[PDB]
Amino acid sequence: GSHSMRYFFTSVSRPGRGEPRFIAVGYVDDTQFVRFDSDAASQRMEPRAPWIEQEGPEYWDGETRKVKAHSQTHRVDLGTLRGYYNQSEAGSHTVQRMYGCDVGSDWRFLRGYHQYAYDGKDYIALKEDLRSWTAADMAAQTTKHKWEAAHVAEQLRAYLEGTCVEWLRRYLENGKETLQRTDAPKTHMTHHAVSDHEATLRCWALSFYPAEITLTWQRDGEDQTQDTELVETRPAGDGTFQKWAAVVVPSGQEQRYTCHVQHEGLPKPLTLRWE
C-alpha cells in the first residue's frame, strides 16, 4: 500500500544545566529505524531496527554528521526564539520539527512535509505545494521572510522529492520482511461484572501492524460511539500494537451488543458477539 518515512526532532532548553537536550528518531511507517540522543554516549546516529544495522560506515558516518548539524542548528533556534518572544533566559522551552515523505502503491512520491512547533504549538509549516510557507503568528512571519530569501522551500522540495522517497524505497526493500508485513488483529471479548445488574463487555485487538485500526461497539446495529470507551492505540513493544473498546451492558442484554474490527490485515471486518 502507501508508505511514509518521517523524522522527529525535539530540542529542549535546560538553561544553566548544560546544552539543549536534542533527540531525533526516524520512522518508516510505524516502524522506528534510527535515533540520535545528544546525551547518549556514542554520539552517533544509531540503529533501532535490525534491518538497518549493516548499511555501512559511510551511511552511519554521513548520518551522524547531519544529525550533529541538526543539533547545532536547533541550539541556535532556541536562543533566537527566546528573542522573538521576549522570553527570559532562565525559562525551559521546546522546539519540535517533523519532516518526511509519502509514496503510493507505485512507490512514487505522493506528498512531502516539514512542520515546526515551539512550546507545543504550531510555529511555521511548509505548505502542501512545497514552495510556500504558513506562519502561525507574528514572530513567525520574520522566520517565514527569512526562509523566502534563503530559498529554503527549494532545498526542502529537493530533499523531499529525491533523497527522501528514494531512501524510503531502499529501506522498504532492505527490511521488506518488517516493512511490507501486515499483522491482522487477534481479537477476543471479555466479560466482567461491575455490579449485579451491570456487566463490562470488552473487545480486544492484539498484535496488529500497522497501528491504523477501528474498533466499534453496537446495540441492535446501532453505533454506541458516544457510550463506548475507546483507548489510544498503544505499542506492545515488539513492533506490533494493541487497542480495546468497552461498553457496559445491563446484565442480560449481552446478545444485543456486538464488536466490529476494521484493519488492513483483515480480509473482512470481524463481528464479535457474546453467545
Binding site: 544529525v67 542548528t73 515546526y116 522566520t143 527569512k146 530533499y159 527522501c164 531512501w167
Partner: peptide, 9 residues
Amino acid sequence: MILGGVFXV
C-alpha cells in the same frame, strides 16, 4: 536518510 544541507529560523 535525513536532510543535509543547512538551515538556520
